[PDB]
C-alpha cells in the first residue's frame, strides 16, 4: 500500500507517486538485484 508507486525513474532516481525522491540511486548503487552476486574484497582482511 505504501510502496506501490515507488519506481526507478528515467533519471535513475527512485521516486514515489508524489514524485518525491526516495533514493538518489536505487540501492545506493543504481544496480538491479539480479546481476549482482557475492564476492570478496582481497585488500580488507590481510595484514599490512
Amino acid at each position: 500500500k505504501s510502496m506501490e508507486s515507488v519506481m526507478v525513474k528515467y533519471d535513475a532516481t527512485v521516486r514515489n507517486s508524489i514524485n518525491q525522491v526516495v533514493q538518489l540511486r536505487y540501492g545506493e548503487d543504481g544496480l538491479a538485484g539480479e546481476s549482482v552476486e557475492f564476492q570478496n574484497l582481497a585488500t580488507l582482511k590481510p595484514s599490512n
Binding site: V14, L31, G33, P46
Partner: protein, 278 residues
Amino acid sequence: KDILCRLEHTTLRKVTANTAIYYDPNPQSTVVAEDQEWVNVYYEMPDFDVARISPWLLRVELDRKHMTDRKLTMEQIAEKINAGFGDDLNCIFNDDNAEKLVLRIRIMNSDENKMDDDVFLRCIESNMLTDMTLQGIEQISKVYMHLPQTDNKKKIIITEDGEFKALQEWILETDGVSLMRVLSEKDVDPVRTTSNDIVEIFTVLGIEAVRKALERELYHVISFDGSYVNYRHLALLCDTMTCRGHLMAITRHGVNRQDTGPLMKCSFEETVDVLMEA
C-alpha cells in the same frame, strides 16, 4: 558487574528482608532486645532529635547477600532516605559487623513537637519499598551480563600489523528502555550502545539513526534463520519509512499520514467518506 548495578533499577524492596512497625515509646528502652545494644551507641550524643521524637518506630532488616550483590552498604541507604525525605525522617542504622542489618526510622521531631502518627508509617513503608530508588535507572527492570561468542556482538579492532582482531568484551543487555540515561552513564560506550526500540532511537538520535537502526532490526529478523535478502530491498523499505522525516507506520495510522490523491485514500479504506470530503 559494578556498571550493571548502576543501571539495573534496585529499590528498597529488593534489598530489604523484613520490616516491622514497632511501637517503641521510649527510644532509650527499646522493645526489641538485640536492637537495644547498638541503639544506645547512637543515643549517647543524639543530634537533631533531642528535642522530640515520634513515639512510633519502623525497623527494617536488610538482606546481607542482596546488599553485597548490589554492592550496597548501610551508608548510602541512610543518606538516600534522608536526602529523599529531608528532615522528615530520622534514620539510625547498626554496624555491618552484626549478622543482621537494621535501620530504625522515626518521623521528624518538629511535626511531633497531622494525618496520623501510625498510618503514616505504613504509607511511608509502602512508599519506600517500591517508589524509593536506591541505585540504578528506572524503567530498566533487569540487566544481563555476558561475553559474546559471536563476531557481531564482539568488538573488532585493527591491530598494529593491520589485521582484524575480535576482542572478548563484556556487554550488558537490559529488559527496559532508557537510552538517554544509559548512554550518559559513566564507563558506558556512548557509540556502540543502542536499543531495539525504534521510537527510543528516533527521539534520542534522529531519523537517520532510525533509518540505520531500522536496517539493523529488519536485517536481524531476516537473517535470524540464515535467510538472505538483498540490501537494496532493505534500504528501500527503510527509506520509505523515514522519507518524510518522522516514523511512518505501515498501518493505516501511519499510511493515512501520507499525502495522496482522493482515489488512493479510497483504495486503503474508508472509501465512501473520503469521496464526500473531496
